[PDB]
Design a protein around this ligand. Sequence first.
Ligand code: K0I
Ligand code: MN
Length: 312
Amino acid sequence: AEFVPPPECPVFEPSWEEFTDPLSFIGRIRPLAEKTGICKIRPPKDWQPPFACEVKSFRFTPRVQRLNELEAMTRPREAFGFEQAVREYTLQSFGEMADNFKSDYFNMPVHMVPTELVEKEFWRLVSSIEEDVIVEYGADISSKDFGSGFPVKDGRRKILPEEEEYALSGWNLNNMPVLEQSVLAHINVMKVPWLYVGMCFSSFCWHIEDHWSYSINYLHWGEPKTWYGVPSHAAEQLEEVMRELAPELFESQPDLLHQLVTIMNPNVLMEHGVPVYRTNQCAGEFVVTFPRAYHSGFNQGYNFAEAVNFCT
Ligand SMILES: O=C(O)CCNc1cc(N2CCc3ccccc3CC2)nc(-c2ccccn2)n1
Ligand SMILES: [Mn+2]
Protein backbone atom coordinates (compact mmCIF):
# COMPACT_ATOMS: atom_id res chain seq x y z
CA ALA A 1 0.00 0.00 0.00
CA GLU A 2 1.45 3.33 -1.10
CA PHE A 3 1.35 6.55 0.91
CA VAL A 4 -1.75 8.69 0.34
CA PRO A 5 -0.78 12.40 0.47
CA PRO A 6 -2.91 14.43 2.90
CA PRO A 7 -4.86 17.40 1.53
CA GLU A 8 -2.93 20.57 0.81
CA CYS A 9 -2.75 23.33 3.41
CA PRO A 10 -3.72 26.88 2.39
CA VAL A 11 -1.27 28.93 0.33
CA PHE A 12 -1.48 32.73 0.28
CA GLU A 13 -0.03 35.05 -2.37
CA PRO A 14 -0.42 38.48 -0.76
CA SER A 15 -0.25 41.66 -2.78
CA TRP A 16 2.27 44.38 -1.99
CA GLU A 17 -0.36 46.18 0.11
CA GLU A 18 -1.21 43.07 2.14
CA PHE A 19 2.52 42.27 2.49
CA THR A 20 3.12 45.52 4.41
CA ASP A 21 3.37 43.85 7.83
CA PRO A 22 3.19 40.15 8.78
CA LEU A 23 1.32 40.35 12.10
CA SER A 24 -1.67 42.09 10.53
CA PHE A 25 -1.66 39.63 7.62
CA ILE A 26 -1.40 36.53 9.83
CA GLY A 27 -4.20 37.90 12.00
CA ARG A 28 -6.48 38.28 8.98
CA ILE A 29 -5.80 34.82 7.51
CA ARG A 30 -6.14 33.08 10.88
CA PRO A 31 -9.84 32.01 10.57
CA LEU A 32 -8.77 29.65 7.77
CA ALA A 33 -5.14 28.86 8.62
CA GLU A 34 -5.81 27.99 12.27
CA LYS A 35 -8.22 25.30 11.03
CA THR A 36 -5.33 23.66 9.13
CA GLY A 37 -2.50 24.21 11.65
CA ILE A 38 0.00 25.33 9.01
CA CYS A 39 -0.15 27.61 5.99
CA LYS A 40 2.21 28.72 3.23
CA ILE A 41 2.87 32.33 2.23
CA ARG A 42 4.42 33.27 -1.12
CA PRO A 43 5.91 36.79 -1.08
CA PRO A 44 5.51 39.04 -4.14
CA LYS A 45 7.62 38.03 -7.11
CA ASP A 46 10.06 40.94 -6.74
CA TRP A 47 10.66 40.26 -3.01
CA GLN A 48 13.99 38.40 -3.20
CA PRO A 49 16.24 38.91 -0.17
CA PRO A 50 19.95 38.08 -0.46
CA PHE A 51 21.61 35.25 1.44
CA ALA A 52 23.64 36.98 4.16
CA CYS A 53 25.31 34.08 5.98
CA GLU A 54 29.09 33.98 6.32
CA VAL A 55 29.65 31.16 3.84
CA LYS A 56 33.46 31.21 3.96
CA SER A 57 33.42 30.10 7.62
CA PHE A 58 30.10 28.22 7.81
CA ARG A 59 30.69 24.83 9.44
CA PHE A 60 28.51 22.51 11.49
CA THR A 61 28.21 18.99 12.90
CA PRO A 62 24.84 17.60 11.75
CA ARG A 63 23.05 15.00 13.83
CA VAL A 64 22.77 11.43 12.55
CA GLN A 65 19.24 10.16 11.90
CA ARG A 66 18.30 6.47 11.84
CA LEU A 67 14.99 6.79 10.01
CA ASN A 68 13.62 3.39 11.11
CA GLU A 69 14.73 3.57 14.76
CA LEU A 70 11.19 3.19 16.11
CA GLU A 71 10.34 0.21 13.90
CA ALA A 72 13.72 -1.33 14.77
CA MET A 73 12.61 -1.59 18.42
CA THR A 74 10.55 -4.64 17.38
CA ARG A 75 13.69 -6.64 16.53
CA PRO A 76 19.62 -5.56 20.05
CA ARG A 77 22.08 -5.70 17.15
CA GLU A 78 25.78 -6.21 17.79
CA ALA A 79 27.48 -3.02 19.03
CA PHE A 80 24.30 -0.94 18.99
CA GLY A 81 24.84 2.77 19.55
CA PHE A 82 28.05 2.83 17.48
CA GLU A 83 26.39 2.97 14.05
CA GLN A 84 27.80 6.32 12.89
CA ALA A 85 29.49 9.22 14.65
CA VAL A 86 28.81 12.89 13.95
CA ARG A 87 31.34 14.73 11.77
CA GLU A 88 31.94 18.33 10.73
CA TYR A 89 30.92 19.61 7.31
CA THR A 90 31.21 22.87 5.48
CA LEU A 91 28.22 24.28 3.63
CA GLN A 92 29.82 23.08 0.39
CA SER A 93 30.93 19.63 1.58
CA PHE A 94 27.49 18.94 3.07
CA GLY A 95 25.82 19.86 -0.21
CA GLU A 96 28.16 17.61 -2.18
CA MET A 97 27.33 14.73 0.17
CA ALA A 98 23.61 15.54 0.04
CA ASP A 99 23.37 15.68 -3.76
CA ASN A 100 25.48 12.54 -4.17
CA PHE A 101 23.27 10.66 -1.70
CA LYS A 102 19.99 11.61 -3.39
CA SER A 103 21.20 11.04 -6.96
CA ASP A 104 22.70 7.67 -6.01
CA TYR A 105 19.59 6.63 -4.06
CA PHE A 106 17.10 7.35 -6.85
CA ASN A 107 19.50 6.82 -9.81
CA MET A 108 18.31 10.16 -11.21
CA PRO A 109 19.52 13.77 -11.26
CA VAL A 110 18.44 15.40 -8.00
CA HIS A 111 16.19 17.96 -9.72
CA MET A 112 14.29 15.24 -11.63
CA VAL A 113 13.03 13.28 -8.60
CA PRO A 114 9.34 14.18 -8.07
CA THR A 115 8.35 15.42 -4.63
CA GLU A 116 5.68 12.71 -4.48
CA LEU A 117 8.35 10.03 -4.98
CA VAL A 118 10.57 11.23 -2.13
CA GLU A 119 7.48 11.44 0.07
CA LYS A 120 6.34 7.92 -0.82
CA GLU A 121 9.82 6.47 -0.28
CA PHE A 122 10.39 8.36 2.99
CA TRP A 123 7.34 6.80 4.64
CA ARG A 124 8.28 3.37 3.30
CA LEU A 125 11.77 3.66 4.81
CA VAL A 126 10.46 4.76 8.22
CA SER A 127 8.49 1.51 8.62
CA SER A 128 11.02 -0.74 6.85
CA ILE A 129 13.12 -3.23 8.81
CA GLU A 130 14.65 -4.72 5.63
CA GLU A 131 16.59 -1.52 4.85
CA ASP A 132 18.52 0.78 7.20
CA VAL A 133 18.80 4.30 5.77
CA ILE A 134 20.89 6.85 7.68
CA VAL A 135 20.94 10.58 6.90
CA GLU A 136 22.23 13.75 8.56
CA TYR A 137 20.44 16.94 9.61
CA GLY A 138 22.26 20.23 10.14
CA ALA A 139 19.77 21.45 12.72
CA ASP A 140 19.80 23.93 15.60
CA ILE A 141 22.47 26.23 14.15
CA SER A 142 22.04 29.57 15.91
CA SER A 143 21.90 32.68 13.74
CA LYS A 144 24.52 34.11 16.13
CA ASP A 145 27.17 31.63 14.95
CA PHE A 146 27.59 32.78 11.33
CA GLY A 147 24.86 35.41 10.98
CA SER A 148 21.26 35.15 9.88
CA GLY A 149 20.30 34.18 6.36
CA PHE A 150 18.64 37.63 6.16
CA PRO A 151 20.70 40.84 6.13
CA VAL A 152 20.90 42.44 9.58
CA LYS A 153 22.03 46.01 10.31
CA ASP A 154 24.33 45.09 13.19
CA GLY A 155 27.60 46.18 11.56
CA ARG A 156 29.02 42.65 11.29
CA ARG A 157 28.56 42.17 7.53
CA LYS A 158 28.35 44.51 4.56
CA ILE A 159 24.85 45.41 3.36
CA LEU A 160 24.40 46.77 -0.15
CA PRO A 161 21.96 49.68 -0.64
CA GLU A 162 19.48 47.49 -2.54
CA GLU A 163 19.60 44.96 0.33
CA GLU A 164 18.71 47.44 3.09
CA GLU A 165 14.96 47.03 2.54
CA TYR A 166 15.34 43.35 3.46
CA ALA A 167 17.29 44.20 6.62
CA LEU A 168 14.40 46.47 7.69
CA SER A 169 11.52 44.32 6.42
CA GLY A 170 8.94 43.04 8.87
CA TRP A 171 9.20 39.65 7.16
CA ASN A 172 12.88 39.47 8.11
CA LEU A 173 12.79 36.81 10.82
CA ASN A 174 15.13 38.93 12.96
CA ASN A 175 12.45 41.66 13.03
CA MET A 176 9.61 39.51 14.40
CA PRO A 177 8.28 40.26 17.90
CA VAL A 178 9.45 37.60 20.35
CA LEU A 179 8.82 39.11 23.80
CA GLU A 180 5.86 37.46 25.54
CA GLN A 181 3.89 39.60 27.97
CA SER A 182 3.92 38.59 31.64
CA VAL A 183 4.25 40.05 35.12
CA LEU A 184 7.67 38.41 35.49
CA ALA A 185 8.89 40.39 32.46
CA HIS A 186 8.30 43.54 34.54
CA ILE A 187 10.13 42.08 37.57
CA ASN A 188 13.29 40.58 36.05
CA VAL A 189 16.07 43.11 35.48
CA MET A 190 16.42 37.48 23.71
CA LYS A 191 15.22 34.84 21.27
CA VAL A 192 16.89 34.69 17.85
CA PRO A 193 16.20 32.67 14.69
CA TRP A 194 17.75 29.25 14.18
CA LEU A 195 19.13 27.74 10.98
CA TYR A 196 18.52 24.28 9.51
CA VAL A 197 20.59 22.73 6.71
CA GLY A 198 18.77 19.76 5.26
CA MET A 199 19.35 16.82 2.92
CA CYS A 200 17.05 14.23 1.37
CA PHE A 201 15.12 12.34 4.10
CA SER A 202 16.32 14.54 7.01
CA SER A 203 13.22 14.98 9.14
CA PHE A 204 11.77 16.55 12.27
CA CYS A 205 9.25 14.81 14.52
CA TRP A 206 5.67 15.66 15.42
CA HIS A 207 5.82 18.42 18.03
CA ILE A 208 4.44 21.75 19.18
CA GLU A 209 6.44 24.83 20.05
CA ASP A 210 7.29 25.86 23.60
CA HIS A 211 4.51 27.87 25.28
CA TRP A 212 2.22 26.96 22.33
CA SER A 213 3.97 29.72 20.42
CA TYR A 214 3.53 30.67 16.79
CA SER A 215 6.44 29.97 14.48
CA ILE A 216 7.49 31.22 11.06
CA ASN A 217 9.89 29.41 8.72
CA TYR A 218 11.63 30.73 5.60
CA LEU A 219 13.42 28.53 3.06
CA HIS A 220 16.36 30.61 1.83
CA TRP A 221 17.37 28.23 -0.98
CA GLY A 222 17.50 24.60 -2.03
CA GLU A 223 15.05 21.79 -2.66
CA PRO A 224 11.62 21.91 -0.99
CA LYS A 225 10.80 21.11 2.62
CA THR A 226 7.69 18.93 3.00
CA TRP A 227 5.42 19.75 5.94
CA TYR A 228 2.54 18.08 7.74
CA GLY A 229 0.30 19.97 10.13
CA VAL A 230 -2.58 19.33 12.52
CA PRO A 231 -4.95 22.12 13.65
CA SER A 232 -4.92 23.05 17.32
CA HIS A 233 -8.50 21.83 17.85
CA ALA A 234 -7.23 18.26 17.31
CA ALA A 235 -4.14 18.62 19.52
CA GLU A 236 -5.42 16.42 22.36
CA GLN A 237 -6.74 13.92 19.81
CA LEU A 238 -3.27 13.62 18.25
CA GLU A 239 -1.60 13.25 21.66
CA GLU A 240 -3.86 10.34 22.60
CA VAL A 241 -3.39 8.63 19.23
CA MET A 242 0.38 9.21 19.28
CA ARG A 243 0.63 7.73 22.78
CA GLU A 244 -1.49 4.71 21.84
CA LEU A 245 0.67 3.93 18.79
CA ALA A 246 4.06 4.85 20.26
CA PRO A 247 6.11 2.03 21.81
CA GLU A 248 4.89 1.08 25.27
CA LEU A 249 8.34 1.90 26.68
CA PHE A 250 7.78 5.58 25.78
CA GLU A 251 4.03 5.87 26.47
CA SER A 252 4.44 7.49 29.91
CA GLN A 253 7.29 9.82 28.94
CA PRO A 254 6.72 13.58 29.30
CA ASP A 255 5.80 15.52 26.18
CA LEU A 256 9.14 17.34 25.92
CA LEU A 257 10.94 13.99 25.75
CA HIS A 258 8.32 12.04 23.78
CA GLN A 259 8.54 14.63 20.97
CA LEU A 260 12.17 13.61 20.34
CA VAL A 261 11.18 10.37 18.56
CA THR A 262 7.62 11.04 17.32
CA ILE A 263 7.96 10.19 13.65
CA MET A 264 4.56 8.85 12.58
CA ASN A 265 2.98 8.26 9.19
CA PRO A 266 0.23 10.88 8.62
CA ASN A 267 -2.04 8.24 7.07
CA VAL A 268 -2.11 6.38 10.40
CA LEU A 269 -3.14 9.58 12.18
CA MET A 270 -5.81 10.27 9.55
CA GLU A 271 -7.14 6.72 9.97
CA HIS A 272 -7.62 7.54 13.67
CA GLY A 273 -9.66 10.66 12.86
CA VAL A 274 -6.89 13.27 13.14
CA PRO A 275 -7.06 15.96 10.41
CA VAL A 276 -3.70 16.37 8.67
CA TYR A 277 -2.63 18.83 5.97
CA ARG A 278 0.54 18.90 3.87
CA THR A 279 2.58 21.32 1.79
CA ASN A 280 5.83 21.55 -0.16
CA GLN A 281 7.64 24.69 0.98
CA CYS A 282 9.83 25.82 -1.92
CA ALA A 283 12.73 28.27 -1.95
CA GLY A 284 11.63 31.79 -1.06
CA GLU A 285 8.37 30.74 0.62
CA PHE A 286 7.22 31.08 4.23
CA VAL A 287 5.47 28.53 6.43
CA VAL A 288 3.57 29.67 9.53
CA THR A 289 2.64 27.25 12.32
CA PHE A 290 -0.21 28.33 14.58
CA PRO A 291 -0.46 27.99 18.38
CA ARG A 292 -0.64 24.36 19.54
CA ALA A 293 -0.54 23.13 15.92
CA TYR A 294 1.37 19.85 15.84
CA HIS A 295 3.68 19.64 12.85
CA SER A 296 6.33 17.41 11.31
CA GLY A 297 8.11 17.00 8.01
CA PHE A 298 11.19 16.12 6.01
CA ASN A 299 13.47 17.71 3.43
CA GLN A 300 13.40 16.79 -0.26
CA GLY A 301 17.10 17.57 -0.63
CA TYR A 302 19.91 20.01 0.03
CA ASN A 303 18.31 23.18 1.40
CA PHE A 304 18.72 25.96 3.98
CA ALA A 305 15.92 27.16 6.27
CA GLU A 306 15.54 29.73 9.04
CA ALA A 307 12.91 29.61 11.78
CA VAL A 308 11.86 31.67 14.79
CA ASN A 309 9.02 31.75 17.30
CA PHE A 310 6.99 34.96 17.41
CA CYS A 311 4.30 36.34 19.71
CA THR A 312 1.10 38.22 18.96
O1 K0I B 1 13.77 22.05 10.00
C1 K0I B 1 13.15 23.13 10.21
O2 K0I B 1 13.05 23.99 9.30
C2 K0I B 1 12.53 23.38 11.58
C3 K0I B 1 11.83 22.11 12.05
N1 K0I B 1 11.33 22.27 13.41
C4 K0I B 1 12.12 21.96 14.47
C5 K0I B 1 13.25 21.23 14.30
C6 K0I B 1 14.05 20.90 15.38
N2 K0I B 1 15.20 20.17 15.24
C7 K0I B 1 15.29 19.15 14.22
C8 K0I B 1 16.33 18.11 14.56
C9 K0I B 1 15.82 17.05 15.55
C10 K0I B 1 15.70 15.70 15.20
C11 K0I B 1 15.24 14.74 16.09
C12 K0I B 1 14.88 15.13 17.37
C13 K0I B 1 14.98 16.46 17.74
C14 K0I B 1 15.45 17.44 16.85
C15 K0I B 1 15.52 18.89 17.35
C16 K0I B 1 16.08 19.92 16.37
N3 K0I B 1 13.74 21.31 16.61
C17 K0I B 1 12.59 22.03 16.71
C18 K0I B 1 12.21 22.50 18.08
C19 K0I B 1 13.08 22.37 19.16
C20 K0I B 1 12.69 22.80 20.38
C21 K0I B 1 11.46 23.35 20.54
C22 K0I B 1 10.62 23.46 19.45
N4 K0I B 1 10.98 23.04 18.22
N5 K0I B 1 11.78 22.37 15.68
MN1 MN C 1 9.86 23.41 16.30
